[PDB]
Amino acid sequence: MKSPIPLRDVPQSNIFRKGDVFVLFGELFGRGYANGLINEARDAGMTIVGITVGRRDENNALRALTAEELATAEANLGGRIINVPLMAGFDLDAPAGEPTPTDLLADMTLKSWQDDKLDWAHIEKCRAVGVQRFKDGVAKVMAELDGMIPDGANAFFAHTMAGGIPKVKVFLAIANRIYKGRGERFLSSSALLNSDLGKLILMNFDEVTANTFLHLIEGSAAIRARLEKSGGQVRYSAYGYHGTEILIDDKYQWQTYTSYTQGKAKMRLERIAEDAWKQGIKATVYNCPEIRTNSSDIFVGVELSLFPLLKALKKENGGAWAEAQWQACREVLSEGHTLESLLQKIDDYNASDVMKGFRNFEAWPMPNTAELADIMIGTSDEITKMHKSRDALVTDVLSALVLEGTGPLMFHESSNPAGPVLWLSHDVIAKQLNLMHRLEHH
Ligand SMILES: NC(=O)C1=CN([C@@H]2O[C@H](COP(=O)(O)OP(=O)(O)OC[C@H]3O[C@@H](n4cnc5c(N)ncnc54)[C@H](O)[C@@H]3O)[C@@H](O)[C@H]2O)C=CC1
After folding, report:
1. Cα of 113 to ligand 1 centre, how many Å?
2. Pick from 216, 223, 208, 217: nearest CA to 279
3. Which residues bind NADH (predicted)?
4. What separation in angstroms does the CA of 46 have from each of 38, 41, 216, 412?
């Protein structure tokens, strides 16, 4: 697409009932986006089922969960977990006794990594082994799930998977320079992406963040057909990131965190949804706002995009509850610092020529720059130092609100989706949150 495809109106329809089955295709963590959606599924009375990625033994081989592990995971999910290790990516896959891609990274150093070259034939061999492992896993899971979804049921498959970062020591050093580095410690995104290391990482990102959705859609085809033929409905959702419209100069304008390294994989995810949609499959990627979760915590500055949600809460027919949210955010700031000052510093940030330059949709994701690093990391740091405690942040409050709002948006839109790719920006999320709280006054 050449511009965002916004969802503007709060959806009101629902087809899901007791007996219908919600499948979490990913693991549920605290602060995770999926919390919003799964709670909706739970309150609609759906049967909750999920997958596990399994665990690694110390021979670094994949294993299913133990009884104890499974019980814990199932209590955390609030439903059954199918005990098959559905770990995506190929960074730890290889033919028996041969190096993994991770092994091939083992002798890269801080001095050598930009120029180190990889045996791409071997990496391709590993990719094939890993991909076939994941497909075989998906077939296992779908075989078991098929027996759990009766004829006539509706099924909701919710994809959440994103990742593919290799567990090697050199990369997090490189990462701290790319994501947090200023001045002489700045390292451009391009430096990583042009290296063989970066190329490998991007291949893994495509596998985990994008191709897993395709494997979900293909792997569940028999179930889909049987349900569709027996009066059921089937839906697929995925969490996308492709920038977000936020209030800049009292207008909702698309912007993004830069540089979003998963960007190529997220656009491949979108393409998978579009291809499936043309085949009559109801698959939708929901491009959701920047928040702080386990997967985005490292992206220092990503959270700068979230603060103007406060202004959206007021703009979208905010009343007493929105005012209470402002009060809540005021309370975590140190005496002498006002929420107004915080928000003005964010408006100043988006007003800057440097930041205005990154509002280029067609160029997304753009490479970062030293100027970007200085203003983004500087601003993020300043705002964090406005807080009473660095463990109680305005962004904690606001990230929880976005979970809460995107939940019903995705759950209800999936009953009758407008298209294969939809943006949930601050406008529609604020509308949803104010509407949910229309009875909470004072
Ligand atoms: N946090 C943010 O700012 C945004 C996140 N998203 C997307 O939301 C989705 C959920 O992520 P978050 O809630 O942010 O964090 P999270 O850490 O709670 O979720 C990550 C999910 O990816 C799964 N995952 C990671 N590696 C995997 C692997 N090798 N194999 C199989 N599954 C794997 C995890 O089980 C988990 O379900 C992701 O796709 C993310 O890209 C979308 C927009 C913004």
Report:
1. 27
2. 217
3. 27, 33, 88, 160, 162, 266, 291, 293, 295
4. 9, 6, 20, 14
- Cβ-Cβ contacts under 8 Å for 404 (sequence gap 6 or more): 36, 433, 436
Q: Determine the distance separating the centroid of ligand 1 and the alpha carbon of 32, expressed in angstroms.
A: 7
Look at residues 429, 423, 430, 428 and name the one whose alpha carbon lies nearest to residue 3: 423
Interval between CA 163 and ligand 1 midpoint (Å): 7
Q: Ligand 1 site: residues with CB under 6 angstroms? A: 26-27, 29, 32-33, 53, 87-89, 160-163, 208, 239-241, 288, 290-291, 293-296, 302
Asked how this structure was determined, the answer is X-ray
Which residues on neighbouring strands pair with residue 85, listed in sequence order?
Answer: 52
Which of 123, 93, 421, 116 is CA-nearest to residue 284? 421
Please name which of 257, 291, 246, 242 lies closest in space to residue 400, comparing C-alpha atoms.
Answer: 291
Count of residues for the chain? 442
Query: Bridge-partner residues for 245, per DSSP?
Result: 254
Which token pair is 362?
């067609």
Where are the chain's structural domains? 21-436
221 three-class SS? helix
Element (H, E) at 382: helix 370-385
